[PDB]
């Protein structure tokens, strides 16, 4: 049933198959399940109960699988933390979240050494020589609590960007993952002996797919290191190496391994289903795709964090005439799914409204605040055709999307206005897709280098949400009511621009 | 050398994006990233061939690391 008893009905019938690889490290099912009874002797000596929350901040690993899985047995919460995005943000995950440890590499110790959480533990999980390493801590003296844990407990949290700059945590439960890890399981027919690349993070739900759906069947998954993010062909590389039937990303990044990695030139033969997820797909570049692998399984995957994927369509041949994206299909993950005018009303084929989904993944709720209460509406735009597939057509909201990542312009904007030299702050995007490019415009106290507010925004945010242009006016469009106008912004920055192409 | 090393932080610093310092982190601070990194490339290449194989932390950490590379690749 739970998560943790599928890695345990795994072992049972798959000892010795390859669990979980890495850049350095591989561990058969019988060694994965030593190294997790290991974590948890330590989980216990270090008095960590079921309920309470561990920081995950390190480079994925083996070590990190094993960690995840012992927290699960124990019902201790694990929450995945950004191992590229700075120490500054981590006391903010950690403040919200009241986690009790960190679990780093003795690299991040100093970080650690300085920061609001210094007097939290930690424990190094790479470097036998540091004091802080697992095995020095001494479990002789400890027990495994007698304890059982329901469907509906809080399994881990996945922390999403913040209006206000404090990351919401999107809290989970085993039945929120396995409702997922069973439809895709049962969907895409994973067997045992298929090997799963793992391209995303830890703190995002498509790595939910590559590890759970994996540990689920007796198949092997394949941790994509951090070291080869920007290099196509090493990805490309990956895949072949590894012999990948199952990817699963953004479409930027197939796109990156189509345009200068060859995917397209060197067919991988080893690739079975080919899973997208988090932005649209240009159809020019998935007609392509879809045309060197004819043979494979292609799907478009949507939602957010708080639901996993509660939509998905099956892509079998696109008509060449096709300009739009592809549906984002029909309900999944066994959810119920359906447009809503601002009103409440049901949408009818045709009708624009926002995306609602109700059934077993939509998240508990963030943690720390009141819990999800009946269906989630996503602050997705969407339309339903005849044949019963919705179309994606935009948000409303302040959440952006820069090559699948997820931005709140008030996250940025905090960080900016941080800067003792900037007074109002603004953030968007111009462009789209692999073009998109995010902007900050500032008013300065006493007029700002682009450098000096790139190092600033890197000591606060991920690099995925440092600003690429900064605009400087003397002061930022407001509407009648006060309020910044975002229209008006957005206008002005599209208008200077397209300046500069005439001049 | 430091005639390679000026011809790349011109082209960072006008094509792409004040100072620009030898040693100033270009992925840590998202100057060079996923989308501007096969730009420079074009670039070092066409007016100058850097392999895949190197597109990672270790050739463009810094501006005197994207400087050994293309050094380095002699014959
Ligand atoms: P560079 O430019 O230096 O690096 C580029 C590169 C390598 C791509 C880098 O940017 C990178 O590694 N990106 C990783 C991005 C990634 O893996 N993201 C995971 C997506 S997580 C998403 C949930 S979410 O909450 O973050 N966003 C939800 C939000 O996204 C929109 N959306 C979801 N799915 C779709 C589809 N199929 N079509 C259009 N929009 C979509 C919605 O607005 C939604 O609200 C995932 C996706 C499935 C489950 N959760």
Redesign the interface.
């Known amino acids: 049933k739970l998560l943790h008893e599928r890695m345990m009905h795994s072992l049972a019938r798959y000892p010795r198959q390859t669990a979980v690889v890495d850049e350095q490290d591989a561990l058969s099912y019988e060694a994965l399940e030593l190294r997790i009874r290991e974590f948890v002797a330590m989980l216990c000596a270090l008095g960590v109960g079921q309920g309470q929350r561990i920081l995950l901040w390190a480079h994925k690993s083996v070590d990190l699988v094993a960690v995840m899985q012992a927290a699960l047995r124990l019902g201790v919460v694990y929450v995945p933390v950004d191992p590229l995005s700075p120490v500054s943000r981590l006391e903010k995950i950690a403040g919200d979240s009241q986690a009790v440890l960190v679990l780093c590499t003795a690299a991040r110790l100093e970080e650690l050494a300085g920061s609001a959480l210094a007097q939290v533990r930690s424990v190094v999980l790479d470097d036998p020589a540091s004091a802080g390493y697992w095995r020095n801590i001494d479990t002789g003296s400890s027990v495994v609590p007698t304890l059982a844990i329901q469907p509906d407990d809080l399994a881990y949290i996945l922390y999403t960007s913040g209006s206000t700059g404090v990351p919401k945590g999107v809290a989970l439960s085993h039945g929120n993952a396995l409702a997922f890890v069973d439809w895709a399981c049962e969907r895409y027919c994973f067997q045992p002996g298929e090997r799963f690349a793992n391209h995303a993070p830890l703190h995002f739900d498509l790595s939910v797919l590559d590890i759970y759906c994996a540990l689920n069947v007796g198949a092997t998954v394949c941790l994509v290191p951090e070291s080869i993010a920007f290099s196509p062909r090493l990805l490309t590389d990956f895949i072949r190496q590894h012999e990948i039937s199952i990817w699963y990303s953004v479409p930027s990044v197939l796109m990156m391994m189509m345009q200068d990695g060859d995917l397209l030139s060197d067919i991988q033969d080893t690739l079975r289903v080919l899973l997208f997820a988090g932005e649209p797909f240009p159809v020019k570049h998935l007609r392509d795709l879809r045309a060197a692998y004819a043979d494979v399984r292609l799907a478009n995957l949507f939602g957010p964090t708080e639901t996993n994927v509660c939509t998905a369509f099956e892509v079998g041949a696109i008509d060449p005439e096709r300009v739009l994206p592809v549906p984002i299909g029909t309900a999944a993950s066994g959810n119920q799914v359906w447009a809503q005018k601002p009103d409440g009303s049901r949408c009818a084929v045709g009708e624009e409204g926002e995306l609602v989904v109700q059934g077993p993944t939509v998240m508990l709720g963030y943690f720390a605040k009141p819990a999800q209460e009946g269906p989630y509406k996503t602050g997705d735009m969407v339309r339903q055709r005849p044949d019963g597939n919705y179309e994606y057509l935009g948000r409303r909201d302040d959440m952006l999307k820069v090559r699948g990542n997820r931005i709140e312009r008030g996250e940025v904007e905090a960080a900016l206005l941080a800067h003792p030299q900037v007074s109002e702050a603004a953030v968007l995007v111009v462009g789209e897709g692999m073009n998109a490019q995010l902007w900050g415009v500032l008013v300065a106290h006493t007029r700002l280098s682009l450098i000096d507010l790139k190092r600033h925004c890197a000591q606060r945010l991920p690099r995925y949400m440092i600003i690429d242009k900064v605009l400087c006016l003397d002061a930022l469009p407001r509407n009648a009511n006060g309020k910044v106008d975002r229209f008006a912004l957005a206008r002005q920055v599209e208008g200077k621009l397209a300046a500069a192409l005439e001049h | 050398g430091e005639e390679v090393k000026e011809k790349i932080r011109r082209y960072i610093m006008e094509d792409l ?4 310092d030898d040693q ?1 982190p270009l ?5 060079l ?3 501007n ?2 730009k420079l490339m074009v670039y070092i290449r066409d007016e100058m061939s850097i392999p ?2 190197h ?3 270790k050739y463009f950490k810094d501006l005197n690391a994207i400087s050994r590379t293309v050094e380095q690749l002699k014959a």
């Open positions: 994006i004040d100072e620009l100033t992925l840590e601070w998202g100057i990233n996923s989308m990194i096969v895949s194989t597109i990672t932390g």
